[PDB]
Design a protein around this nucleic acid. Structure first.
Ligand SMILES: [Mg+2]
Ligand SMILES: [Mg+2]
Ligand SMILES: [Mg+2]
Length: 135
RNA sequence: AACGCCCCGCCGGCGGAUGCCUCGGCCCGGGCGGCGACGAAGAGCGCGGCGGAGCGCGAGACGCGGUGCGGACCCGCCCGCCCCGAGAAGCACCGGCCCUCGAACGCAGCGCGCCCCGGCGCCGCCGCCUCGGUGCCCUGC
């Protein structure tokens, strides 16, 4: 149950916020769970999805694995190579089938200096959280 | 007869009710209470690579600069970016640019002056400079 009176629980307001979010909020809302092996390596659960990493689709009619080749931020959809609509002819450029990030698992992440710094920033902040509860 | 017209059992039109759904309205509470001659509110006309309306902006024009945060895209076609910082989208604050009308300020509204050096509106308060008066006096003549 919510106790913060400054946060709205109105359906109309929540949906309006969802449909008119700015760029960074949209990016954060497009996260996927990390695999068990990646969870052990970095002590985090989810990661914003980015072009260049590998995912596994675990639900829907287009299950599979592939590399992320495009992010459509104003639809909340991604295109992964090899997941296409069935073609009318064998000679036509494939049409990707857009997929929501919340039904895939990240298998391997494309690594940057900025990604490293962001992950390290994340870990050092839930370390305080864990130190402040339990143990 | 037959056709035409009017009434059942299937299939088509025309029209847009109904049902379900809605980033919209309306009411109640809380906060705030901040414009302008340092040129406001409002109006006009312009500004995009391919650009009509709307938003935004002002010849530095569909934006420029600084400081922080952010971290891969940029609705089409293009161009660009890609990196342990090398920087796309976004966000906050600060500094500037700011055409013509408008309280609207050389006159007038699209034309024309004065001036000598650059500048030339009104009203008020304070102060200064230059002056007037058979006002009240005084001196000299
Ligand atoms: Mg236009
Ligand atoms: Mg004028
Ligand atoms: Mg005038």
């Amino acid at each position: 149950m919510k106790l913060n009176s400054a946060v709205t629980a109105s359906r109309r307001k929540c949906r309006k916020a969802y449909f008119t979010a700015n760029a960074e909020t949209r990016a954060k809302m497009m996260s996927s769970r990390l695999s068990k092996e990646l969870r052990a390596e970095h002590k985090i659960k989810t990661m914003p999805i980015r072009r260049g990493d590998i995912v596994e689709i675990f639900t829907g009619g287009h299950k599979g694995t592939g590399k992320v080749v495009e992010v459509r931020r104003r639809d909340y959809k991604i295109c992964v190579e090899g997941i296409n609509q069935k073609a009318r002819n064998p000679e036509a450029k494939p049409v990707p089938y857009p997929i929501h990030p919340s039904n895939c698992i990240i298998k391997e992440l494309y690594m940057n200096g900025s990604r490293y710094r962001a992950i390290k920033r994340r870990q050092e902040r839930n370390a305080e959280r864990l130190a402040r509860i339990g143990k």
